[PDB]
């Protein structure tokens, strides 16, 4: 009996100051969000969106990241109207890092939970600065952190899809989801977009003032070395795409704990073989 929501949100206020030098805490944002349920689950109480949107994000010893992330985003995310989830996927042990494979895990682990029908795909250190950049699906893959400050408010090329993506289910299972093995910094986003062109579909994205996006500044990560193969495996996205992705995953999940604002999925995504 709930009629849809507005195509577009009312709720929205456009540009917002960002800030990332106060401390947070995240028993104080979730007093402030009391809307937000158990797991970091809200949909709209008046009306029903469109928008089924679990947000992914690959996850290691960045909490104090999150916190930001969190403090910024869950807000955001309900001015959207959304019925969406968080999904902090935080890769087990201490050898080299797997940020797409950690999104695969996020994908299928996700929709254990709920019918979603759209991904949201961010790094833990992203903030978009305009509400108006929609954190959901279109009809077309969308790259969502397009005016990074990091890169000077543009894209650094203009095939360049990494920060913070959007795909539809059906999206994401046409390109075989995400290469798993992209070990270490560098490539995997490319990747994804070889993937998604051989697949026929191009890049939707909101206009540069409204994509304008905030990086917390930070080091180098231990254990995310740039991978020196990453040249090469751009290059022969067609032929291994076939293969590696969905269709080639496994993975052992060691702990699934609800917090109020997320859900973190801790899991084991093994090393190169
Ligand atoms: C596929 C890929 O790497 N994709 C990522 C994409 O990469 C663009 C380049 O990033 C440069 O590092 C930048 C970084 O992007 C930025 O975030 C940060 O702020 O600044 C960094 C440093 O300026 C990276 O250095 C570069 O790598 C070099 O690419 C060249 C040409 O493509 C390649 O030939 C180099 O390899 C070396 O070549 C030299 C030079 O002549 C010598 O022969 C060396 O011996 C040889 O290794 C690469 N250089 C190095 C040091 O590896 C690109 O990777 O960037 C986006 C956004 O950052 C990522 O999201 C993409 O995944
Ligand atoms: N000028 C100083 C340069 C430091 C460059 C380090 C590379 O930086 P970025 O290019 O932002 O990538 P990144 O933030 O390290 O990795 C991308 C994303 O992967 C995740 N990630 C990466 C490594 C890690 O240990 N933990 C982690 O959670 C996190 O979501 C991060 O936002
Ligand atoms: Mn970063």
Redesign the pocket.
């Known amino acids: 009996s709930l009629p849809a929501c507005p195509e577009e949100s009312p709720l929205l206020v456009g540009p917002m100051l960002i800030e990332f030098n106060m401390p947070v805490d995240l028993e104080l944002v979730a007093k402030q969000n009391p809307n937000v349920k158990m797991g970091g689950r809200y949909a709209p109480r008046d009306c029903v969106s469109p928008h089924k949107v679990a947000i992914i ?6 909490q104090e ?1 999150l916190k930001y992330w969190l403090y910024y985003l869950h807000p955001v995310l309900q001015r959207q109207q959304l019925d969406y989830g968080i999904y902090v996927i935080n ?1 087990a042990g201490d050898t080299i ?1 797997n ?1 797409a494979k ?1 999104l695969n895990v996020g994908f299928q682990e996700a929709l254990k939970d709920y019918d979603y029908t759209c991904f949201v795909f ?5 903030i978009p600065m305009n509400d108006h950049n929609a954190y959901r699906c279109f009809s077309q893959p969308r790259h969502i952190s397009v005016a990074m400050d ?1 890169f000077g408010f543009s894209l650094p090329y203009v095939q360049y899809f ?1 920060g913070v993506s959007a795909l539809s289910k059906q999206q994401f299972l046409t390109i075989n989801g995400f290469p798993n093995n992209y070990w270490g ?2 490539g995997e986003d490319d990747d994804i977009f070889n993937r998604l062109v051989f697949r026929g579909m191009s890049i939707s994205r909101p206009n540069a003032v409204v994509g304008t996006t905030r ?1 917390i ?8 070395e740039p991978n020196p193969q990453r040249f090469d495996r751009i290059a022969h996205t067609k032929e291994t795409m076939l293969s590696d992705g969905l269709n080639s995953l496994t993975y052992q999940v060691l702990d699934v704990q609800r917090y109020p604002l997320y859900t973190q999925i801790t899991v084991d995504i093994g090393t190169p073989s």
């Open positions: 994000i690959p996850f290691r010893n960045r990241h890769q890092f940020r950690l961010s790094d833990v250190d992203l990091k990494g910094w560098g990086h500044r930070h080091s180098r990560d231990k254990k995310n």
